[model samples]
Target: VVGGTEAQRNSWPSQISLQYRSGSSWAHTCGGTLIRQNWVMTAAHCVDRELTFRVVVGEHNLNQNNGTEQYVGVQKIVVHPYWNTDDVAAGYDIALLRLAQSVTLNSYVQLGVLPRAGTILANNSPCYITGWGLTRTNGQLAQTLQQAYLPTVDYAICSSSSYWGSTVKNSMVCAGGDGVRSGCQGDSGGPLHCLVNGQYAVHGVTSFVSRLGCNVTRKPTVFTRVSAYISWINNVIASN
Candidate 1:
């Protein structure tokens, strides 16, 4: 994430590195959240390409072995039926990855708590965006996970003409349009942890940033509102 600080090793246990095999090595492509022992929530755009994928849970550094890491193969991928790659502004940029095996819970690995269905944070609510994405626009991905405070921008203001305008839909959550800190490439599919009722919950799946740059004024990072799809998530998990 641009303008982010390195996160503490155990700060966000639910954060994961979604990687794809590249020759003999694997490369981190996006971030994801562990929603269950074997299920991960991410952006549908992250998996639009055809490639073999794996997930590394409890990972803090991409170049170092954190012993705490649990590498698991992806057994299946389910993108939102309505998601259209050509039209991300239409919303529904969410997806789920079914891990081949369940991961064990520990200090560095755990399930992320999802907000109650239909839950919406108040304007400027406290939140943070975490990922291994770029540290700057067009920059390289960070070796370590990074996080930055990204206050919620609320739908009304975000949809204003000067802001994201019509591109900002209610199904999406906008945050950190301050042009200082925001999610960038490789951060897509990460979590937007929002504090609610004294606890932090996975409220968003990082979806997009401004085309002008990672951190752009009047163009905060946009995310798929996780609370809006609780029923769909449940149905997918229950049936799959």
Candidate 2:
């Protein structure tokens, strides 16, 4: 989700690491948000195959050991019942992960609010996205967390072209531009935050489209809006 100018970079929200262990190897899975002391919001796809994973909070530089990176087990993994892996119509790609242990709130790992509905994110509005994803397209993911500024693109413009038109849905929103600057692999399930009320709010979750090239003008980055899934999230959390 990183694009735009330096100011936008400064406004980006902090990110958490979603790591998973496959066999004897450990790899960075995806990015997530610290919504509460023991809860995180991430894409359902990230948890579809795994029953448990590790959530590392408050580390901008994974290469450095100074930041607190916790290995909290997933006490519960709840995905929207209507979530469909095939298409975006259901708009249920959201999921919640309850940490086995609670984390201490700090400057780097803080809770974020959900943006209200009808909040228009104008095209080219400066926004920021970060992750441990690939530095370059088709390249290996970076060991450390990286930050980038991206511009919000109008869904209308992104959905008009045949490339994105068929895939982009009303429940999906697009960001970034041509591959010049965009969120790369490993950034999925990360937050697309917007600054409001002097704090950052989770507006969307990084979602991928068919277009492989990143940052294409017409082919903007797509994300699942957080506001739309709040009710389902609350129900799942409360029932659990």
Candidate 3:
């Protein structure tokens, strides 16, 4: 993320590196949250390209092998039915991946607790965006995971003409529009964790930033609101 600091190893236990086979090596492409032993939550646009994919749980640095990492193949991908690659602003940007095998849970590897259905954060609620995304608008992905405090921007303000305008939907969450810290390239599909009742929960799936720039003023990073899709998520897991 732009204007972020290196995240503590194991601080965000549920974060995963979504990678694709790049020639003879696997490269981190997007971030995801481990919602179950065998299920990962990410963004639909992250997998728009057809490629061999895998996930690494308990990863911190992309270039180094942290002993805690658990690599697994992606068995199946289920993008939201309404998601349209050409219209991300229309929402439904979420996706789920069924892992080939269940990864063992540990201090460094665990499931991300999701927010309750229909939950919405109050304006300016405390949250953090974590990923290996860009450190700047035109920069490359970070070597290690990074995190930035990106407080919530309520729909009314985020959808204002001077902000994201009508592109910010109620089904989405907006955060960090200060032209400072925000999600950038390579961070898509990552979690936007919000602190609620003294615990952190996954409340968003990183979706997009302004076409103008990653840390543009009044254009907060947008995400698929997890609470708005709990039913869809549950149904997918149950029937898959």
Candidate 4:
């Protein structure tokens, strides 16, 4: 399901960049899936008060080639109540960010539907992941959007003795292998998107790390299963 070129990378719609100010430095972090006008889905660990973060939508390049940065300020940060900053929860690593402003719907930016629990992702499910993450562990983050194709992994294989082991949970999904192609540093909170009904839908949020390197066969890249938090997400969005 990996798209081969940069043109193919622009096809998916849920991509977003979470920009924040760190001291005098401006940092661009990755996030995905605009759930509503003012709410965006991302990983819990990405939230920080000192960082004046804004979610930039609809731009493939950090230089703003596709469209102007939407520039939505973060109004509130909501992490999963069960998410323990101490120990990695076997699952439950998702979070919702409330934006200070709403974004106008556009072809390059749109909401995505959640797949039901136990729904199996077929092999080579036409899926892709994008980010400003490092090309390799210990490498600098890419300034422009970079993408990679990945296949859905079965729980048995992901939880096997060599891979993520028993750490894989029902609330998580795994992609990539032996390090040939995978998510790496700065990819946290980005989307694992699948093409459906001729559009891209986010199935998961890049979450924890099994390893830092890109091509470790035994280390599988993990994602926060979005379907597991649908209700809580809806409730929070509704209440807000």
Candidate 5:
């Protein structure tokens, strides 16, 4: 996050750290939501490299041991058939990573609750962007996970001329155009947990930020609307 505080270890249990193989070491690249014991939701762009990627659950600190962390390899990755890498602004940026094995659920690791199909948040609805992403523009990542309250911005306003314009689609959820707090690089493919009906659910998959900068005013963080792809997600998991 651009300007955010460290997240509690148990605050977002479904949050997973997606890492890629870098020579002999693994590097954290994006975040994901654990939808099932063997399935994770992320962005199509995150897996564009097709490199050896792994998912780490129950991770709080990126640099040290959290004790409850579960490292699992990706057995399969299913990107949306309609996803266009050249046109992420056109939406459909979501993808699912099938884990090599079903992970055991516990207090430290659990599944993320997803919203019903076609659900939409009202303007200024409360949400959060969490990740071990950069602390500042062009800066190093924080040692611990960071989180920021990024209120949802309605599509109408977000797609207005002064905002993201045509880049913002109804299929996307625009959150936290608030200049002080936002998601940045390394935060992509993460979860945008929104509180609706008392419980927090994974509503958005971190996709893109503004072209000007990470926290540019009026250019809220853009996410792949999870509610828009519930059926596709279910079909993929069931078929595979």
Candidate 6:
């Protein structure tokens, strides 16, 4: 993120560090949200690398050993059938990973609540984007988790010519285009936690950013609308 602050431990219990085996250790590649005991929600592009992936729940720090961390291998991946990597701007960027084993819920590890299907937030709704992604565009990954305030930008504003234009679809949510605080390189597949009523829900999945840069003016961070795929999500879980 371009402008973010350190996230306190256990502050984002549902956030998980999605990592891939690199040499003798794991390297953070993207962020994911635990939607169930064995299911993780992330971006399709995050797992397109074809490498063995693992998820670290209750992980606030990526480089150190945290007592709350639970490292689990990914057993299977279910990318949205409509997702086209070559056509990311066309949307459908969500994916789900089945963990090798179910994780126990606790203060540091929990499931992320999802918004109702097709629910849309009004413009400028309160929300936060959390991840261990880059502190700046093209920068090294952060050791600790970080969070940036990125209020929602309704489809009307986000689809404007000066904003994301044709790239921002109704199936997506846009936030943080002020060129100050926004999602960066490693934030893909993370949660766009929006406060509705009195509780925070996983409203979006970090999808894309401006072609210009991470924090470009008026080109807000785009995300996969979680509500848009709830039916697909529930079906996938039920069939499995």
**lDDT on C-alpha atoms for all candidate structures:** 0.96, 0.70, 0.96, 0.72, 0.92, 0.92
TM-score of 2: 0.87
Model 4 TM-score is 0.88
Q: Estimate each model's TM-score.
A: 0.99, 0.87, 0.99, 0.88, 0.98, 0.99
RMSD to the true structure for each prediction, in A, is 0.5, 3.0, 0.5, 2.8, 0.8, 0.7
Tens-place lDDT digits, model 4, residues 75-140: 988888888756664567778889898887777776755666545565446667778777776676
Give the better candidate number (2 or 4) by lDDT: 4
Clash-forming residue pairs, model 4: 2-149, 178-215, 178-216, 178-217, 179-215, 179-216
Stretches of candidate 4 off by over 4 Å are 1-10, 48-50, 63-67, 122-124, 196-199
- List, residue by residue over 1-240, the lDDT tens digit for candidate 6: 679999888788999999999989889999999999999999998988889899999998787788888989999999999999899988889999999999999999999999999899999999999988888887878889999999999999999999978878999999989898999988999999999999999999999887778888898899999999999999888877
Residue 190 C-alpha lDDT in model 5? 91
Please tell me which model should have the higher TM-score, number 2 or number 5. 5
| Model 6: CA > 4 A from native | none
On residues 1-240, what C-alpha lDDT tens digit does candidate 3 reach at each position? 999999999799999999999999999999999999999999999999999999999999999878889999999999999999999999999999999999999999989999999999999999999999989998999999999999999999999999988898999999999998999999999999999999999999999999899999899999999999999999999999
Q: Which residue pairs collide in model 5, if any?
A: none
The TM-score that candidate 6 achieves is 0.99
Span of 10 residues, lowest total lDDT, candidate 5 = 134-143
> In candidate 4, where is summed lDDT lowest over 10 consecutive residues?
1-10
- Clash-forming residue pairs, model 3: none
